[PDB]
Coordinates of C-alpha atoms and ligand atoms in Angstrom, one line a residue:
Chain P
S25 CA 9.9 -6.4 112.3
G26 CA 9.0 -9.4 109.5
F27 CA 8.3 -12.2 109.6
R28 CA 9.9 -15.8 108.3
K29 CA 9.7 -19.0 107.8
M30 CA 12.7 -19.6 110.7
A31 CA 13.8 -23.2 111.2
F32 CA 15.9 -24.0 114.1
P33 CA 19.7 -23.2 114.0
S34 CA 21.4 -26.9 113.0
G35 CA 24.7 -27.2 114.9
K36 CA 24.2 -29.4 117.6
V37 CA 23.0 -31.6 115.4
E38 CA 24.8 -31.5 113.2
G39 CA 27.6 -33.2 115.2
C40 CA 25.5 -36.3 115.6
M41 CA 24.6 -37.5 112.3
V42 CA 26.3 -40.3 110.8
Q43 CA 26.2 -43.0 107.8
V44 CA 25.2 -46.0 108.7
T45 CA 26.0 -49.0 106.6
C46 CA 24.5 -52.4 106.3
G47 CA 25.7 -54.6 102.9
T48 CA 24.6 -52.5 100.4
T49 CA 22.4 -49.8 101.9
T50 CA 23.8 -46.6 103.2
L51 CA 21.7 -44.4 105.2
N52 CA 21.8 -41.3 107.9
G53 CA 22.3 -42.5 111.9
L54 CA 21.9 -40.6 114.9
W55 CA 24.6 -40.6 117.4
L56 CA 23.8 -39.4 120.9
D57 CA 26.0 -40.6 123.7
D58 CA 27.4 -44.6 122.4
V59 CA 24.6 -45.4 120.9
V60 CA 23.2 -45.3 116.8
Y61 CA 20.0 -44.8 116.0
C62 CA 18.2 -45.4 112.4
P63 CA 15.7 -46.8 109.8
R64 CA 15.8 -50.7 110.6
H65 CA 15.3 -50.8 106.7
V66 CA 19.2 -50.6 106.6
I67 CA 19.9 -54.0 106.9
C68 CA 16.8 -54.1 103.8
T69 CA 17.5 -55.4 99.9
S70 CA 15.7 -53.2 97.4
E71 CA 13.9 -56.6 96.7
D72 CA 13.1 -57.2 100.7
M73 CA 11.3 -54.3 100.9
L74 CA 7.9 -54.6 99.0
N75 CA 7.3 -57.7 101.5
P76 CA 9.9 -57.5 104.3
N77 CA 10.2 -60.1 107.6
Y78 CA 12.8 -57.8 109.8
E79 CA 12.9 -60.5 112.1
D80 CA 14.1 -62.8 109.6
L81 CA 16.5 -60.8 108.0
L82 CA 17.7 -59.4 111.5
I83 CA 18.7 -62.6 112.3
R84 CA 21.9 -63.2 109.3
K85 CA 23.1 -60.4 110.7
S86 CA 26.1 -59.7 113.3
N87 CA 27.8 -56.9 115.1
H88 CA 30.3 -56.6 112.0
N89 CA 28.2 -56.4 109.2
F90 CA 27.1 -52.9 109.7
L91 CA 29.7 -49.8 109.0
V92 CA 28.7 -46.9 111.2
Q93 CA 31.3 -44.1 110.1
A94 CA 31.5 -40.4 111.3
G95 CA 33.4 -38.2 108.8
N96 CA 36.6 -40.4 108.6
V97 CA 36.0 -41.8 111.8
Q98 CA 35.1 -46.2 111.8
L99 CA 32.6 -46.7 115.0
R100 CA 33.2 -50.2 116.5
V101 CA 29.8 -51.7 117.0
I102 CA 29.9 -53.9 120.0
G103 CA 25.7 -54.5 119.9
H104 CA 22.6 -53.7 118.0
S105 CA 19.2 -54.6 118.9
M106 CA 15.4 -53.6 116.3
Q107 CA 13.2 -51.9 118.8
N108 CA 10.3 -51.0 116.5
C109 CA 11.0 -49.8 113.8
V110 CA 14.8 -48.1 114.5
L111 CA 17.7 -49.9 114.6
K112 CA 19.9 -49.4 117.9
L113 CA 23.6 -49.8 117.6
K114 CA 26.0 -50.5 120.6
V115 CA 29.4 -48.4 119.8
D116 CA 32.3 -47.9 121.4
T117 CA 33.3 -44.3 121.5
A118 CA 30.7 -42.0 122.9
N119 CA 30.1 -38.9 120.8
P120 CA 32.0 -36.0 122.5
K121 CA 29.5 -34.2 120.8
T122 CA 26.0 -35.3 122.4
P123 CA 24.1 -32.8 122.9
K124 CA 22.4 -32.1 125.8
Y125 CA 18.6 -33.9 125.1
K126 CA 15.5 -35.4 125.2
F127 CA 13.1 -38.1 123.0
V128 CA 9.5 -36.8 122.3
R129 CA 6.7 -38.4 120.9
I130 CA 4.2 -34.9 119.0
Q131 CA 1.0 -34.5 118.1
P132 CA 0.0 -33.7 114.9
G133 CA -0.2 -30.1 114.1
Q134 CA 3.1 -29.6 115.8
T135 CA 6.0 -27.8 114.5
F136 CA 10.1 -28.8 114.1
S137 CA 12.7 -28.2 111.8
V138 CA 14.2 -30.9 109.6
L139 CA 18.0 -31.2 108.7
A140 CA 17.9 -32.8 105.4
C141 CA 21.1 -35.4 105.1
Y142 CA 22.9 -37.8 102.9
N143 CA 25.3 -40.1 103.7
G144 CA 25.9 -38.5 107.4
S145 CA 26.3 -34.8 105.8
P146 CA 23.8 -32.2 106.3
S147 CA 22.6 -31.4 103.2
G148 CA 19.8 -28.5 104.5
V149 CA 17.3 -26.9 106.6
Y150 CA 13.6 -26.5 107.4
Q151 CA 10.8 -26.3 108.9
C152 CA 7.6 -28.1 108.7
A153 CA 4.4 -29.3 110.5
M154 CA 2.8 -32.9 111.5
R155 CA 0.4 -33.2 108.9
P156 CA -3.3 -33.9 110.6
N157 CA -3.3 -37.2 109.0
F158 CA 0.8 -38.2 110.5
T159 CA 2.1 -37.0 107.2
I160 CA 4.7 -34.5 106.5
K161 CA 5.0 -32.1 103.2
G162 CA 9.3 -32.8 103.1
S163 CA 11.6 -32.6 100.3
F164 CA 13.6 -35.7 100.3
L165 CA 15.4 -37.6 98.1
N166 CA 17.1 -41.7 98.8
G167 CA 19.2 -42.2 100.9
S168 CA 17.4 -38.9 103.0
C169 CA 16.0 -41.9 105.3
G170 CA 17.7 -40.9 108.2
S171 CA 17.2 -37.8 108.3
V172 CA 16.2 -36.5 112.0
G173 CA 13.5 -33.7 112.9
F174 CA 14.1 -31.2 116.5
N175 CA 13.2 -28.4 118.0
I176 CA 15.5 -26.5 120.5
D177 CA 14.9 -25.3 124.0
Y178 CA 17.4 -22.9 125.0
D179 CA 20.5 -26.1 126.0
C180 CA 18.5 -29.4 124.4
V181 CA 17.5 -30.7 121.6
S182 CA 14.7 -32.5 121.1
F183 CA 14.3 -34.8 119.3
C184 CA 10.8 -35.7 117.3
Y185 CA 11.1 -37.4 114.0
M186 CA 13.3 -39.9 112.4
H187 CA 12.6 -40.3 108.2
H188 CA 12.1 -43.9 106.7
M189 CA 9.7 -43.3 103.4
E190 CA 8.1 -41.7 101.0
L191 CA 4.9 -42.5 100.1
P192 CA 3.8 -43.2 96.5
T193 CA 1.4 -39.6 96.3
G194 CA 4.8 -37.9 97.6
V195 CA 4.3 -37.0 101.2
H196 CA 6.3 -38.3 103.3
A197 CA 6.2 -40.6 107.0
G198 CA 8.5 -41.5 109.6
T199 CA 8.7 -42.7 113.2
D200 CA 9.2 -40.8 117.0
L201 CA 13.0 -41.7 118.2
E202 CA 11.0 -45.4 120.6
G203 CA 10.9 -47.1 116.3
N204 CA 7.4 -45.9 116.8
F205 CA 5.5 -45.2 113.3
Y206 CA 3.7 -41.2 113.4
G207 CA 0.0 -42.9 111.7
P208 CA -1.2 -46.1 110.5
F209 CA 1.8 -46.5 108.7
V210 CA 4.4 -49.4 108.0
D211 CA 8.0 -50.3 106.7
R212 CA 7.1 -51.6 103.6
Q213 CA 7.3 -50.5 99.9
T214 CA 3.4 -50.8 99.5
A215 CA 0.6 -48.7 98.6
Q216 CA -0.6 -47.0 101.3
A217 CA -3.4 -44.2 102.1
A218 CA -3.5 -40.9 104.0
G219 CA -6.8 -39.6 104.8
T220 CA -7.5 -35.9 104.4
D221 CA -5.1 -33.4 104.6
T222 CA -7.2 -30.5 106.9
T223 CA -5.8 -27.1 107.8
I224 CA -4.6 -26.6 111.3
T225 CA -6.5 -24.2 112.4
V226 CA -5.2 -22.6 115.8
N227 CA -2.1 -22.7 113.1
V228 CA -4.0 -20.7 111.1
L229 CA -4.7 -18.0 113.9
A230 CA -1.8 -18.0 115.5
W231 CA -0.1 -16.4 111.7
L232 CA -3.1 -14.2 112.0
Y233 CA -1.6 -12.3 115.0
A234 CA 1.4 -12.0 114.0
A235 CA -0.2 -10.5 110.6
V236 CA -1.5 -8.1 113.2
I237 CA 1.3 -7.6 114.8
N238 CA 3.6 -6.7 111.5
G239 CA 1.0 -4.0 110.6
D240 CA -1.0 -6.6 107.5
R241 CA -5.2 -5.2 109.2
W242 CA -7.3 -5.3 106.5
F243 CA -9.4 -8.4 107.0
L244 CA -10.2 -7.7 110.6
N245 CA -13.9 -7.4 110.2
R246 CA -16.5 -5.9 111.7
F247 CA -18.2 -9.1 113.0
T248 CA -17.7 -11.5 115.9
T249 CA -18.4 -15.2 116.1
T250 CA -19.5 -18.3 118.0
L251 CA -17.2 -21.5 118.9
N252 CA -20.3 -23.8 117.3
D253 CA -20.8 -21.0 115.1
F254 CA -16.9 -21.2 113.0
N255 CA -16.2 -24.7 113.5
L256 CA -19.8 -25.7 111.4
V257 CA -18.6 -23.1 109.0
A258 CA -14.2 -24.6 109.8
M259 CA -15.3 -28.3 109.1
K260 CA -17.2 -27.5 105.0
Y261 CA -14.2 -26.3 104.7
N262 CA -11.7 -29.5 106.0
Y263 CA -10.1 -27.1 109.1
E264 CA -9.6 -29.0 112.1
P265 CA -12.4 -28.0 114.8
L266 CA -11.2 -25.4 117.4
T267 CA -11.3 -26.4 121.5
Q268 CA -11.1 -24.4 124.5
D269 CA -7.4 -25.5 124.3
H270 CA -6.7 -23.7 121.5
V271 CA -8.7 -20.6 122.4
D272 CA -6.4 -20.6 126.2
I273 CA -3.0 -21.2 124.1
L274 CA -3.8 -17.9 121.8
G275 CA -4.3 -15.7 125.4
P276 CA -0.3 -14.5 125.5
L277 CA -1.2 -12.9 121.7
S278 CA -5.1 -11.8 121.9
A279 CA -3.7 -9.7 125.5
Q280 CA -1.0 -8.7 123.1
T281 CA -3.0 -6.8 120.2
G282 CA -6.4 -6.8 121.7
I283 CA -8.0 -8.7 119.7
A284 CA -10.7 -11.2 120.9
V285 CA -9.8 -15.2 119.6
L286 CA -13.5 -14.7 118.8
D287 CA -13.3 -11.9 116.8
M288 CA -9.9 -13.4 115.0
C289 CA -12.3 -16.6 114.6
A290 CA -15.1 -14.5 112.5
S291 CA -12.6 -12.7 110.5
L292 CA -11.1 -16.3 109.8
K293 CA -14.9 -17.6 108.7
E294 CA -15.0 -14.2 106.6
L295 CA -11.8 -15.4 104.5
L296 CA -13.3 -18.9 104.6
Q297 CA -16.3 -17.7 102.9
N298 CA -14.9 -15.3 100.5
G299 CA -11.3 -15.8 99.7
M300 CA -8.6 -13.1 99.8
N301 CA -10.2 -11.3 96.3
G302 CA -6.3 -11.3 95.1
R303 CA -5.0 -9.9 98.7
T304 CA -2.0 -11.2 100.5
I305 CA -1.2 -12.0 104.1
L306 CA 2.4 -11.5 105.0
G307 CA 3.0 -12.2 101.2
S308 CA 1.4 -15.0 101.4
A309 CA -2.2 -15.6 99.1
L310 CA -2.9 -19.3 100.9
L311 CA -3.7 -19.9 104.9
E312 CA -0.5 -20.6 106.3
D313 CA -1.2 -22.8 108.8
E314 CA 2.7 -24.4 109.6
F315 CA 3.4 -21.4 112.5
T316 CA 2.1 -22.8 116.0
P317 CA 0.9 -20.2 118.5
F318 CA 4.5 -20.9 120.6
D319 CA 6.5 -20.0 117.3
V320 CA 4.7 -16.7 116.6
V321 CA 5.5 -15.6 119.7
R322 CA 8.9 -17.4 120.2
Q323 CA 9.3 -14.8 116.4
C324 CA 8.3 -11.9 117.3
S325 CA 10.0 -11.7 120.9
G326 CA 13.3 -12.5 119.8
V327 CA 14.2 -15.9 122.3
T328 CA 17.7 -17.4 121.4
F329 CA 19.3 -20.9 122.3
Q330 CA 23.0 -22.4 123.3
Chain Q
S15 CA 10.0 -35.5 96.5
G16 CA 8.7 -32.3 97.9
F17 CA 10.5 -28.9 97.7
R18 CA 10.9 -26.3 100.2
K19 CA 12.1 -23.5 101.1
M20 CA 15.3 -24.8 102.6
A21 CA 18.0 -22.9 104.3
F22 CA 21.9 -24.1 105.3
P23 CA 23.0 -25.6 107.9
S24 CA 24.5 -23.5 110.1
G25 CA 27.0 -24.8 112.2
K26 CA 29.6 -23.5 110.9
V27 CA 28.6 -19.8 111.4
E28 CA 27.4 -20.7 115.1
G29 CA 31.1 -20.9 116.3
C30 CA 31.9 -17.5 115.0
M31 CA 29.0 -15.1 116.7
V32 CA 29.8 -13.7 119.5
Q33 CA 28.3 -10.7 121.5
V34 CA 30.0 -7.5 121.1
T35 CA 29.1 -4.6 123.1
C36 CA 30.5 -1.0 123.2
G37 CA 29.1 2.1 126.4
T38 CA 25.2 1.0 125.9
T39 CA 24.8 -0.6 123.0
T40 CA 24.8 -4.6 122.6
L41 CA 25.3 -5.9 119.2
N42 CA 26.1 -8.8 117.5
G43 CA 29.5 -9.9 115.9
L44 CA 31.4 -12.0 114.2
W45 CA 34.9 -13.4 115.1
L46 CA 37.1 -15.2 112.9
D47 CA 41.0 -15.8 112.9
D48 CA 41.9 -13.0 115.9
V49 CA 39.0 -10.0 114.0
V50 CA 35.9 -9.8 115.6
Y51 CA 33.2 -7.9 112.7
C52 CA 30.3 -5.7 113.8
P53 CA 28.3 -3.0 112.3
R54 CA 30.5 0.6 113.5
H55 CA 26.6 2.0 114.8
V56 CA 28.3 0.1 117.6
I57 CA 29.6 2.7 119.0
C58 CA 26.7 5.3 119.3
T59 CA 23.9 6.2 121.2
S60 CA 19.8 5.6 120.3
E61 CA 20.2 9.8 119.8
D62 CA 24.0 9.3 118.4
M63 CA 21.7 7.5 115.1
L64 CA 20.0 10.7 114.2
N65 CA 22.6 12.4 112.3
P66 CA 26.3 10.7 113.4
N67 CA 29.5 11.8 113.0
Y68 CA 31.2 8.5 113.3
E69 CA 35.1 9.3 112.3
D70 CA 34.1 12.2 115.5
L71 CA 32.5 9.0 118.1
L72 CA 34.9 7.1 117.4
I73 CA 38.4 9.4 118.6
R74 CA 36.4 8.5 121.9
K75 CA 36.8 5.4 122.4
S76 CA 39.9 3.4 122.7
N77 CA 40.7 -1.0 122.8
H78 CA 39.1 -1.6 126.3
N79 CA 35.7 0.2 125.4
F80 CA 34.6 -3.0 123.4
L81 CA 34.0 -5.3 125.4
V82 CA 33.4 -8.4 123.4
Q83 CA 32.0 -11.9 125.1
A84 CA 32.1 -15.4 123.0
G85 CA 29.6 -17.2 126.0
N86 CA 31.3 -16.4 129.1
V87 CA 34.6 -16.2 127.6
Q88 CA 36.0 -12.3 127.5
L89 CA 38.0 -11.2 124.3
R90 CA 40.7 -8.8 124.4
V91 CA 40.8 -6.0 122.1
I92 CA 44.4 -4.8 120.9
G93 CA 43.4 -2.9 118.2
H94 CA 40.6 -1.2 116.7
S95 CA 40.0 0.8 113.0
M96 CA 36.9 1.4 110.7
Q97 CA 36.9 0.0 107.3
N98 CA 33.6 2.0 105.7
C99 CA 30.7 1.1 107.6
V100 CA 31.8 -2.4 109.6
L101 CA 34.4 -2.1 112.5
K102 CA 37.1 -4.5 112.2
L103 CA 38.5 -4.9 116.2
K104 CA 41.3 -7.2 116.5
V105 CA 41.4 -9.5 119.7
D106 CA 44.1 -11.2 121.2
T107 CA 42.9 -14.8 120.9
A108 CA 42.0 -17.0 117.1
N109 CA 38.7 -18.2 117.4
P110 CA 40.1 -21.7 117.8
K111 CA 36.6 -22.8 115.6
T112 CA 37.3 -20.6 112.3
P113 CA 35.3 -22.7 109.5
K114 CA 37.5 -22.6 106.3
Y115 CA 36.3 -18.3 104.8
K116 CA 35.5 -16.5 101.7
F117 CA 34.4 -12.8 102.2
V118 CA 31.8 -11.9 99.0
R119 CA 29.6 -9.2 97.2
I120 CA 26.7 -11.3 96.0
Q121 CA 24.7 -9.7 93.2
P122 CA 20.5 -8.5 93.4
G123 CA 18.5 -12.3 93.0
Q124 CA 21.0 -14.3 94.6
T125 CA 20.2 -16.4 97.8
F126 CA 21.1 -16.8 100.8
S127 CA 20.9 -18.2 104.6
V128 CA 20.6 -15.4 107.8
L129 CA 21.2 -16.4 110.5
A130 CA 19.1 -14.2 113.0
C131 CA 20.8 -13.6 116.8
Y132 CA 20.6 -12.0 119.8
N133 CA 23.3 -10.5 122.7
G134 CA 25.8 -13.1 119.9
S135 CA 23.4 -16.6 120.4
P136 CA 21.9 -17.8 117.7
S137 CA 17.5 -17.2 117.2
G138 CA 16.9 -18.5 113.5
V139 CA 18.0 -19.7 110.6
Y140 CA 16.3 -18.9 106.9
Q141 CA 16.9 -18.2 103.3
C142 CA 16.1 -15.2 101.2
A143 CA 17.3 -12.8 98.4
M144 CA 18.6 -10.0 97.7
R145 CA 15.7 -8.1 96.2
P146 CA 16.8 -5.5 92.8
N147 CA 16.7 -3.0 94.9
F148 CA 19.0 -4.1 97.8
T149 CA 16.8 -4.3 100.5
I150 CA 15.8 -8.0 102.0
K151 CA 12.4 -8.9 103.3
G152 CA 13.7 -10.1 107.1
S153 CA 12.6 -11.2 110.5
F154 CA 14.7 -9.1 112.9
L155 CA 13.9 -7.5 116.3
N156 CA 16.2 -5.4 118.1
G157 CA 19.3 -6.4 118.7
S158 CA 19.5 -8.2 115.2
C159 CA 22.3 -5.8 114.1
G160 CA 25.7 -7.6 113.7
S161 CA 23.6 -11.1 112.5
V162 CA 24.7 -12.3 109.4
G163 CA 24.0 -13.8 106.5
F164 CA 25.8 -16.2 104.7
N165 CA 25.9 -19.7 101.8
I166 CA 28.0 -22.7 102.1
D167 CA 29.7 -24.3 99.2
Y168 CA 31.6 -28.5 100.8
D169 CA 33.3 -27.2 103.1
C170 CA 33.6 -23.3 102.3
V171 CA 31.3 -20.8 104.0
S172 CA 30.6 -17.2 102.3
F173 CA 30.2 -14.7 104.2
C174 CA 28.0 -11.5 101.7
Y175 CA 25.6 -10.0 104.2
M176 CA 25.7 -8.3 107.3
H177 CA 22.6 -7.1 109.4
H178 CA 22.8 -2.9 109.8
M179 CA 19.4 -1.1 110.1
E180 CA 15.5 -1.5 109.5
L181 CA 13.9 1.1 107.8
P182 CA 10.3 3.3 108.1
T183 CA 9.2 0.9 105.4
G184 CA 9.9 -3.2 107.6
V185 CA 12.6 -4.1 105.0
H186 CA 15.9 -4.2 105.5
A187 CA 18.9 -3.2 104.7
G188 CA 22.8 -3.9 105.5
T189 CA 26.7 -4.2 104.3
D190 CA 29.3 -6.5 102.5
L191 CA 32.1 -7.8 104.9
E192 CA 33.6 -5.4 103.7
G193 CA 31.5 -3.0 105.4
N194 CA 30.3 -1.0 102.3
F195 CA 26.3 -0.8 101.7
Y196 CA 24.1 -2.7 99.1
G197 CA 22.1 -0.7 97.4
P198 CA 21.9 3.5 98.4
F199 CA 21.1 3.6 102.2
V200 CA 23.2 4.7 104.7
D201 CA 23.4 4.1 108.5
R202 CA 21.8 7.2 109.4
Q203 CA 18.2 6.5 110.8
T204 CA 16.4 9.2 108.7
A205 CA 14.2 8.4 105.8
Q206 CA 16.0 6.8 103.2
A207 CA 13.5 5.6 99.8
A208 CA 13.8 2.2 98.6
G209 CA 13.0 1.8 94.8
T210 CA 10.7 -0.3 92.9
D211 CA 11.0 -4.3 94.0
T212 CA 10.3 -5.8 91.3
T213 CA 10.1 -9.7 90.6
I214 CA 13.1 -11.9 90.3
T215 CA 12.5 -13.5 86.5
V216 CA 15.4 -15.8 86.0
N217 CA 14.6 -17.1 89.8
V218 CA 11.0 -17.9 88.9
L219 CA 11.8 -19.0 85.9
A220 CA 13.9 -22.2 87.9
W221 CA 10.7 -22.7 90.2
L222 CA 7.9 -23.7 87.8
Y223 CA 11.3 -26.3 86.5
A224 CA 11.3 -28.1 90.0
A225 CA 7.7 -27.9 89.8
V226 CA 8.0 -29.8 86.6
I227 CA 10.6 -31.9 88.1
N228 CA 8.0 -32.4 90.9
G229 CA 4.3 -33.2 89.2
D230 CA 2.7 -29.5 88.5
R231 CA 2.3 -29.4 85.5
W232 CA -0.3 -27.7 85.0
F233 CA 0.7 -24.1 84.6
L234 CA 2.5 -25.8 81.3
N235 CA 0.5 -24.5 77.8
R236 CA 0.6 -24.4 73.8
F237 CA 2.9 -21.7 73.0
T238 CA 6.3 -20.1 72.6
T239 CA 7.5 -16.9 72.1
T240 CA 11.2 -14.7 71.6
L241 CA 12.7 -13.3 74.4
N242 CA 12.0 -9.8 73.2
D243 CA 8.0 -10.4 73.1
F244 CA 8.2 -12.1 76.4
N245 CA 10.8 -9.0 78.0
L246 CA 7.8 -6.6 76.9
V247 CA 5.2 -8.3 79.1
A248 CA 7.4 -8.9 81.6
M249 CA 8.2 -5.2 82.1
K250 CA 4.9 -3.8 82.0
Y251 CA 3.9 -6.1 85.3
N252 CA 7.9 -5.2 87.5
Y253 CA 9.3 -8.4 86.6
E254 CA 13.2 -7.9 85.7
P255 CA 14.5 -8.2 82.6
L256 CA 15.3 -11.8 81.0
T257 CA 19.3 -12.2 78.9
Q258 CA 20.9 -14.4 77.5
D259 CA 23.2 -14.9 80.3
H260 CA 19.6 -16.6 82.4
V261 CA 18.7 -18.4 79.8
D262 CA 22.2 -19.9 79.8
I263 CA 22.5 -20.5 83.2
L264 CA 18.5 -22.6 83.3
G265 CA 20.3 -24.8 80.9
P266 CA 20.6 -27.9 82.7
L267 CA 17.2 -27.7 83.6
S268 CA 16.1 -27.1 80.4
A269 CA 18.0 -30.4 80.0
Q270 CA 16.5 -32.2 82.2
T271 CA 13.2 -31.6 82.0
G272 CA 12.6 -30.9 77.5
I273 CA 11.0 -28.2 77.8
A274 CA 12.9 -24.8 75.7
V275 CA 13.2 -21.7 77.8
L276 CA 11.5 -19.9 75.5
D277 CA 8.5 -22.2 75.4
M278 CA 8.3 -21.9 79.9
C279 CA 8.2 -18.3 79.1
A280 CA 5.6 -18.3 77.0
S281 CA 4.0 -20.3 79.9
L282 CA 4.8 -17.9 82.4
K283 CA 3.7 -14.8 80.4
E284 CA -0.1 -16.5 79.8
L285 CA 0.3 -16.5 84.3
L286 CA 1.0 -13.4 84.7
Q287 CA -1.5 -12.1 82.1
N288 CA -4.4 -14.6 83.5
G289 CA -3.8 -15.8 87.0
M290 CA -3.1 -18.7 88.4
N291 CA -7.3 -18.7 88.8
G292 CA -7.7 -20.0 92.4
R293 CA -4.8 -23.1 91.3
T294 CA -1.6 -23.6 93.2
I295 CA 1.8 -24.3 91.5
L296 CA 4.2 -26.4 94.2
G297 CA 1.7 -24.7 97.6
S298 CA 2.0 -21.1 96.5
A299 CA -0.7 -19.0 95.0
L300 CA 1.9 -17.0 94.2
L301 CA 4.9 -17.0 91.6
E302 CA 8.1 -17.9 94.1
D303 CA 11.0 -15.8 92.9
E304 CA 13.8 -16.7 95.9
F305 CA 15.0 -19.9 94.1
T306 CA 18.2 -19.4 92.4
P307 CA 18.4 -22.1 89.5
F308 CA 20.8 -23.1 91.5
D309 CA 19.2 -23.6 94.5
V310 CA 16.9 -26.0 92.6
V311 CA 19.3 -28.2 91.3
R312 CA 21.5 -28.2 94.1
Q313 CA 17.8 -29.8 96.3
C314 CA 17.1 -32.1 93.2
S315 CA 20.1 -33.6 93.7
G316 CA 20.9 -33.7 97.3
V317 CA 24.4 -31.9 97.6
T318 CA 25.7 -32.1 101.0
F319 CA 28.3 -29.9 103.0
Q320 CA 31.3 -30.3 105.6
Ligands
LIG15 C1 17.2 -30.8 128.3 C2 17.8 -31.5 129.2 C3 17.5 -32.8 129.5 O1 17.2 -34.6 129.2 N1 16.0 -32.0 129.8 C4 15.2 -33.0 130.3 C5 13.5 -32.9 130.7 C6 15.9 -30.8 129.2 O2 14.9 -30.3 129.5
LIG16 C1 36.8 -22.3 100.9 C2 37.8 -21.7 101.4 C3 38.3 -20.8 100.8 O1 39.8 -19.0 101.6 N1 38.5 -20.5 99.3 C4 39.0 -20.2 98.6 C5 39.2 -19.6 97.0 C6 37.2 -21.5 99.5 O2 36.4 -22.0 98.5

C-alpha cells in the first residue's frame, strides 16, 4: 500500500544524453542511433533570441561548428538539418546504448517523466502532466534546454517532450521530437500568452479511485449525478468536461472498487462545492490531477520494465 | 524556475538489482561486487513470518538453495551468511556494473530516492524522507521487499535503505545495508507500534526558502521570534524542535534571500496558528517537509551527477 508520485526509471534515457555546443551556447542533446536531436536555438546568441531568423542564422553554420560531447567522448558531426524547431545532427558513431524507442506526440492531460539535465549530465527525474493549455509546470534552470520527457512501455522508451523555453510566467514549453511545439508557442524570447490552466478531471477521478483502494474513503457521499449535471458544475470551477471516452477509460477502476464512475463524480462535485474542510486525501489537501487512470493501475498492480 | 519533488537518476542502481529466490519466496537483491544483499526473510514461508527463528531456519539452507537471477543471467552462490537482518550471498561473478558506492546509515528527516522493484526489475522511482518515528511513507506492494533507497554524490551511490516490512498501519519499515533496522521494528509479522509522526521543521523552513526564491512571498509577515518562543509553539503542533545546528545548516539560504532564519520562523509560526486560509505555497496547501536544506540548494543550483 501507499501512493506516491512515481517517475519512470531513468537508466535507459541517461545513456542517451549528450552535450551540444555551437558558438558559446551549450545545452543538451538526445543521441539515438547516429543522430543527435537538440533545440534549434542552440545556434542563437542571447541577443538573437529576441527576434531570431533561424534559416539565416543556420546558413552561417557548418558541420564543424557543432561540438557534441558524450562524457569525454567526442562525436563527429557529418551532417545537419533543421526539422521544425529541432536540429538533427548526424554523427559518425551510433550510440551503443540506444534503447528500443519510438517518438510520440502526447495529448494534454497525459503524464510523463522528465530527466532534467545540465551539460549533458542528469540532475534529477520527476513526473508531470502536460497541462490543458499545453504548458508543463516543470523545474528547469538555465542550461536545461534539450532535457527530454519520456514514458516506458516494458523495454520501449517513448520520447514525447523536449524542453525549449521558460515563459515569463514561470511555466515551461517545448516540442515533440519532430520539433513541433506543443501549443501556440514559438522559440522566440517574447511575451507569450498561455490560456486558462484547467484541472484534468479524468485524472482527479483516477486519483480518487486510488484513494479508495488505499483506504481513504471519507469523501464518498450518498449522492449520484449525471454527466451533464456534473459537467455543468465542473465548468464553473475551471475543470475539463468529462466525456464518455473518459468514463470508458475509468471502467477497470470502477470494477475493482465497486464504485460507479457517476457515483464518484457526485462525490467530486460535493468536494468542489464544499471544499475539503481541512481534511486530506492521500496526504494532499488539494485535488491532484497528475495521475492518469493508467498511472493508477500501473502503481497499484506493480508493473515493471526492462 | 519551478520546484518539483525530484528523485535522483536511477541508472546506476538499476544495474544492481537482481531477483533472489529461496524455496517459494521471491524478492529483490542488491548485487555489488561479488555479494548479493537481500532481506533475511527470503528464507521464510508465509507461516514462518508470524514467529520466525531465523538461525534455526537458516540451518536447513545450503548455498544451492538460493537462486539468484540477473535478467536471464544465473549467478552461482558459493557462500552465504546472516548479518543482522540481511543475508549476504557470495556469488561467483562480480557485477560488471558495480557503481562506486558506500553504505550509510541516515538520520530521521533526511531524504533519499527509492527504486521500487518487483522480481529484480525496476518499477518506478520516488523521493521520500525518513520520518522522525523511523518509518517511511512509501509505495510498496507484495514482492517489493529488498528494494533500496539511495542518494547520489557526483559519481558515488550511497545506499541507505532496504525495504523489509509494511506495518499494519500502512507505513513501511526497513534496514540500513548492514541489516540494522531503522527504529524499534523487527522482521516478524506482529502488531508493532510506531510513535508520533512529527513534522520535520528544518525541512519545512528550507521549503519556505525555496518558495521565496521561486516567487511565493505572501506568507512573509512583519514579525520575528526567538528560538525558545518558536519551539514552544512548534511542540504544540507536533513539530520537531529547532536547534542551533538547524539554524547553521539554513545559513546559505538565509544569505541568498536576505531573510533571517528567525524571521522565517516567525512566518512559519503564524502559518501554524492561522493556517493557510485557502492559499497555497509552491502549489501545495500543506506545509511540505520532504525537502532538506541540501535538496533545495541542489535543485535551485542545478547540481548534476555521473
Ligand atoms: C518499442 C520498440 C519500438 O520501436 N516499438 C514499435 C511500435 C515499441 O513498442
Ligand atoms: C564514492 C566512492 C566511495 O567509495 N567513496 C568513499 C568515501 C565515495 O565518496
